[PDB]
Ligand binder design. Structure first.
Ligand SMILES: *[C@@H]1O[C@H](CO)[C@@H](O[C@@H]2O[C@H](CO)[C@@H](O)[C@H](O)[C@H]2NC(C)=O)[C@H](O)[C@H]1NC(C)=O
Ligand SMILES: *[C@@H]1O[C@H](CO)[C@@H](O[C@@H]2O[C@H](CO)[C@@H](O)[C@H](O)[C@H]2NC(C)=O)[C@H](O)[C@H]1NC(C)=O
Ligand SMILES: *[C@@H]1O[C@H](CO)[C@@H](O[C@@H]2O[C@H](CO)[C@@H](O)[C@H](O)[C@H]2NC(C)=O)[C@H](O)[C@H]1NC(C)=O
Ligand SMILES: *[C@@H]1O[C@H](CO)[C@@H](O[C@@H]2O[C@H](CO)[C@@H](O)[C@H](O)[C@H]2NC(C)=O)[C@H](O)[C@H]1NC(C)=O
Ligand code: NA
Lengths: 454, 454, 454, 454
């Protein structure tokens, strides 16, 4: 019938044009704009909260490194290790003697938790004899703990076994009180640090690094956010249901052309002419709404102090706000002069992906080559992750002279890998800057002329 | 009438063409060139003066940090803090004992000002008990000062309260004499420093940073600039009045087409055909003249020693000289071969702004996403200011490998934010370098061809 | 005959099209895909092995620098030297006294090798008299060794001759046992370090640098890889023989057109019409197969502990995997929409090489100029290698501000080389960024339009 | 006459085409190729000589800083200063006591020169009273020397006057013998250092920096280059005379068209049709020959030990070799496919200069603005030289994040210059990267199409 062709002309016409005919001023538009504003304000007010939470942990952890580590100035987290026997002993006894007299030496209300369990782990039968090259090593690990309670030889006379040694760990806990919350006129948030000091001897290289790790677990001692959080779940869920009804109309009006192309005998057209009917942005909207309400329920769990994980709530709210922001562009394309420029992206996106395959093959070629060859001689080419980050930083040009000076200084070791380094880096840089990037310029330019001139 | 169409042909014709007809060689041109030269010379002679003023304050302030701070080598302004109890006491008593014997230890004529008022600020009732989680904190701040006069136990027996502590400040003043002015054969400029040493304990993290701040207030003890300053106010004010008469002729000859398009019945054309009549550069000239004379009156107030603020005079003279310089281009466009190239900018400026909206939406998307997600795990993503500076530095390519190595080193903490970091940074960099920047190249190129071929 | 024109139409048709006619589904295709996969897995499993081998040597060598060198913190490999007489003596006696008591001071099973041969090398007749400017120097080198055996004055009373001195070297060896292999449940790999400490006085400048060098030689004490290695030699050799038969058909069907262009009288066409017949990728395949089997036989020699050289096996496997990866593109060009984009590279590669000559002449001009002129005054322009690396890093833009600040700080020495530095660097940067790189953009763009429009 | 039109056709035809007609195979071509080769070899053999000369001075000067300066580790040339009274005294007495016992403490044959003249310079009448603000300062400088001869109270009891002080300088000289020349089997080159230690108190800021400066004067104690140097002066002078005869033919055959355009009545054409007749590369050749022979005569003066100045010989030989290298391009343009690409540069060079004016005006606008405004608050914007180097490093993108972090850290001081810093740097970077650089791309592209299509 000719009536069902008129069923399409409502759905195909823009929301801007449907004020003259039916006189329905859009509320769905206003729900979209309110959803933008309410999500972004919810993101900012959450993010400032974690800013004041994280800097308290970071500043206390630096304060523990200056209290419990022997000879520590900042800038030496990684390159800090014990190299002699007495230096490892004096590191251990400095840590515990700077634990027992804590409240005088500290600069806060660091209280104890009922405490310090020192322990070393050595192999069951570590028999090593490089004067005979015969051995008998039993890989069972023997834990050997010792207990320390705060208010000598019960703690002293501690004897390591340096011919069989894996780790020396120190566990204790400290409870403090956050003081900024009392300025903010609220219920305080007492923290409980879990300090772990580890003398790792994993590789057995004659070098024992030292590192300190903490972990907190907040619990309350003796609103505007919560009302705003039930708003952001309510409006965004209503947008989920409303545009689910729009997908309902798409999937039900799909059949009335398939019926209609059998009576008109439209030859049962393939994938594209049923692809060009449904939608182009409401998929982005519906995954924004699922992602938003999952993050906000997770946030209510966070700030009601049954929390245990900052990671999932942060990543879901961040990705949700990102997709809500790129949902603005579809309102820009209702104007003509913007619709040309956005159409340049869609006519250029297939050909730029067809070229992206031919780039990634050669790029992975130089990754696998440079990692094995310049691995033992450079320091930015240790693992394949660092190789891909280094080469892709050199595509645009970030750090060329430091890589060339690293191969210039030590001469690799032989002349062959230096002669290979010059040819490797010059061929790579001159390939991808001059030819490949200029093909990206030519593809976007030709796509612009194609969308322009007819 | 046909006579009023001839009223337009004088105003519409260039200043270069009006030497043949009326024989008036331009003086308005020469006032513009003199205004360029006199403003720039006034800027340079002012800027060299503040160069010798600022380096004296900077070098003295470094000299105070080496005199009054315990164990200070340069490069440690930020990461310098007290971590134990005796270190904070020895920092205070080092500061005052390096104040009392000042003239032997100093390397100048540092005189005293009648002096040192040491003080600490503690809460009214600071009751903290982490062994009970009960408390009573009164947020009233109790100031507790003590006075020190230079030529023990009146200053000694100073007892802090480390369970209730906010700040420990030290105020004193020092007067010296600038010696370079006597070489310049003039009246000297005695300075008065206001040294503030602060032991901040704001966040209560177990870490008390130390910083020193000074402030000067110049006052005289027992020309060519001033004549040049009354010149630069006089000529620039005359240009303000002269081009105000040009805007007067524009606003009065506007009506004689509006009358004329009612008798010819020109249908009362909209905004653009009355926009294309007035001017295109004299708005820039008139705001240059207002800005110049405001800055120069401010400068006379500065160098007549009733000064109090370097900020407004510096920013007004700087912006005024900038706009005077970009007023040169309108003399370049009287030639034909330059007029083509300047017309490329005006035909490309609308479309590049229409594209600038579609860039800024996606860019603010990646800002709000990256700040919350990679905030607690990176160090360049602490606040939203640092995120926008970091991402916009990565648009052109500044510091890619340091951001990738920061996420490579600590593994974030979990595998999920590392796996998210790789996808976030690779998608962002490959978006804005390859596609968006190439659209900027294509837009300026198509605008050039549009202005060229007809 | 017309039959021999049909001999060409099989060889000229694609492998994809020969399933409809003869019904031979391709196995040569599947040998190519298996050759890609097996080479890359062989590369990765080899590269992870050398990762755990290299970090053991690197961490032990850092541990020897902290044991045997006086006052060594990391970051001071290069700028570390002895400047007085007693400092060189105390460096030597610290090295040997930290050798004799090794097992207490060490943190491993460092055993001895039966040992320490200290030696100095002085000239035969070193007569120097700057108070007379007369001399007699005999360039014969007198080696003067001394022997030290571990469990005073036999080693003490060592007297240098500082008026005639070249080198002071210290040789000893240490055997340790790698402990990670016992966790990996295999036969261990005992290492033997060859520590060389050298006090170089080559240039005789009053500055004796200190450096430590090690060298290992692995030997066993008291599979899946090997089966996979005989697979990777077998399949890749079979591809070598199969495509050698394809080159056989090319060289034998070449003559049946040369015969045919004498009976048709095709005028004996020159180089190009016999160049366009043979192949375009099987040269790349056959050099991939030669390179692969050479590297894998070398690898079997490596991991069967008769090894002696990591260099050739690493560089042959790396280059082989690179060429195998760029052999994927020829399967992408069987599709049409990829064939256009790959044809852009071949139509642009001649003209970009014709322009690469005209770039390299001017670039070598600025290399020879900048090296002699700014050599003694900069630090990145010491040798011609560092000049070419610095200028080519400044083509794209890496490190501009550090080079400008290096010429800004010391003022060179005179005003002339500073005035020359500004003109040199501004002319170079503004040449190659604005004009030359834009010619690369224009050449690839015009090549794209040439391949597109007909 | 028609004969004089044939006088032009010899001079206008290429050197390649004149082998068929007259049969004169070119020797002028071979003199050009020999001039390229001989100049570059002369440059390299000179530059390696100054490499071994400069590193001897640099390594000895570092050795003097470690001998004569109190507490000096490398990396602290600039930030090294005395801040108390006893530190300046102990710096002076450390310098002289590390002079008197030199030969034991040194590591070479450092002999004396008959010696150490210590001196201080104080004002004639330095009356300063900040407790009264009255003074009497006489700017006459009173030199006060003292003499020290090497093999206490004659040198001790040295009393400075810290209320009137300008400089404290120390002069002495040391003669050593270069030892590498005896390995090179030649006559040695004894050096004579002129060590200057200066305690500058110029600005009178309470901070006295310390620096050490040396200066050498080589003189001999008790070839292949020289023959090659008389070759490079001989051949290059012959090219000067030969192409002077070519300019002679140009200036004499110029008149026979000016006579000919008066009898044909060619209307006495203006500047361009007499500009297009003479030459296009022999001006470059003749200034190359003048510059080469001036540098080589200067070099003969250098290496015959009456030398006194490395600067002019280095800069003349460097610029001469540069112009000789860019003289190769005119041999490339005899081929057709290179002649198109070189013609792109000449058709694009006028329009790129017409645009270079409009760039430099706005660029100098941002220079004068940013220097006065962000001068006292940044550290890369101190002088106008550093501003132009910083902004031009930010055109391509070098160091964006360090400039943004410098304005982010200290908050300037007030919110106004931070709010101005964000607007200044974002507007500048987004102007010159997106619009101006894309105009350079469009100009070279349109010039390429103009030279291509007809
Ligand atoms: C020190 O080494 C011991 C091994 O001797 C580590 O114990 C292992 O820890 C991992 C994860 O922590 C477990 O999967 C293993 O089951 C543990 N092995 C045994 C035998 O219990 C110990 O974790 C190391 N210390 C640190 C701080 O990592
Ligand atoms: C140290 O802390 C005290 C608070 O205990 C600060 O005093 C406040 O200072 C700000 C601005 O300086 C004022 O707006 C408040 O009104 C002050 N509070 C009171 C109770 O007076 C003090 O400024 C801090 N010290 C420094 C150097 O900032
Ligand atoms: C220290 O100097 C001596 C020379 O006095 C070096 O001995 C030369 O070493 C090179 C290569 O090592 C040989 O080619 C020469 O033949 C050696 N000369 C003599 C006379 O034997 C010695 O190598 C230097 N030390 C170090 C560690 O390089
Ligand atoms: C230390 O200061 C004195 C001034 O008191 C400097 O002497 C002047 O030096 C410059 C150039 O060296 C000359 O142009 C002046 O004529 C000198 N003045 C007098 C009064 O002689 C001296 O040079 C400074 N020391 C150093 C190492 O620069
Ligand atoms: Na950098």
């Amino acid at each position: 019938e000719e009536d069902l062709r008129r069923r399409l002309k409502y759905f195909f016409m823009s929301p801007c044009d449907k004020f003259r005919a039916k006189g329905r001023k859009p509320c769905k538009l206003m729900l979209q704009v309110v959803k933008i504003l309410v999500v972004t304000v919810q993101l900012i007010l959450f993010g400032l909260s974690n800013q004041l939470v994280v800097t308290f942990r970071e500043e206390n952890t630096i304060a523990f490194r200056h209290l419990f580590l022997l000879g520590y100035s900042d800038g030496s987290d990684d390159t800090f290790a014990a190299y002699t026997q007495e230096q490892l002993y004096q590191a251990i006894f400095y840590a515990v003697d700077q634990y027992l007299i804590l409240p005088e030496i500290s600069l806060g209300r660091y209280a104890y938790v009922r405490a310090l369990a020192l322990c070393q782990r050595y192999y069951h039968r570590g028999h090593v004899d490089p004067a005979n090259d015969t051995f008998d090593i039993d890989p069972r690990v023997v834990t050997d703990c010792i207990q320390v309670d705060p208010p000598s030889a019960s703690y002293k006379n501690l004897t390591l076994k340096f011919h069989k040694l894996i780790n020396v760990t120190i566990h204790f806990q400290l409870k403090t009180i956050n003081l900024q919350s009392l300025i903010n006129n609220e219920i305080p948030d007492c923290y409980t640090f879990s300090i772990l000091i580890t003398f790792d001897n994993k590789a057995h290289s004659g070098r024992i690094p030292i590192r300190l790790e903490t972990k907190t677990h907040i619990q309350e001692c003796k609103s505007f956010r919560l009302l705003f959080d039930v708003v952001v779940i309510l409006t965004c869920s209503l947008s989920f249901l409303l545009c689910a009804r729009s997908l309902l109309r798409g999937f039900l009006l799909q059949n009335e052309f398939v019926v209609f192309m059998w009576r008109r005998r439209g030859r049962e057209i393939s994938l594209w002419e049923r692809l060009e009917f449904v939608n182009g942005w409401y998929i982005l909207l519906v995954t924004s709404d699922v992602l938003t309400i999952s993050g906000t329920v997770m946030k209510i769990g966070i700030e009601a102090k049954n929390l245990a994980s900052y990671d999932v709530c942060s990543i879901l709210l961040g990705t949700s706000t990102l997709l809500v922001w790129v949902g603005v562009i579809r309102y820009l394309t209702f104007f003509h002069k913007y619709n040309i420029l956005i159409a340049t992206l869609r006519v250029a996106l297939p050909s730029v992906m067809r070229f992206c395959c031919c780039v990634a093959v050669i790029y992975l070629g130089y990754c696998f080559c440079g990692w094995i060859v310049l691995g033992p001689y450079h320091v930015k080419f240790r693992s394949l992750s660092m190789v891909s980050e280094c080469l892709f930083s050199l595509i645009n040009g970030d750090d060329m002279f430091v890589t060339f000076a690293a191969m210039q200084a030590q001469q690799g070791h032989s002349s062959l890998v230096w002669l290979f380094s010059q040819l490797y880096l010059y061929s790579f840089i001159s390939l991808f800057i001059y030819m490949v990037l200029s093909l990206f310029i030519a593809l976007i330019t030709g796509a612009y002329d194609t969308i322009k001139h007819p």
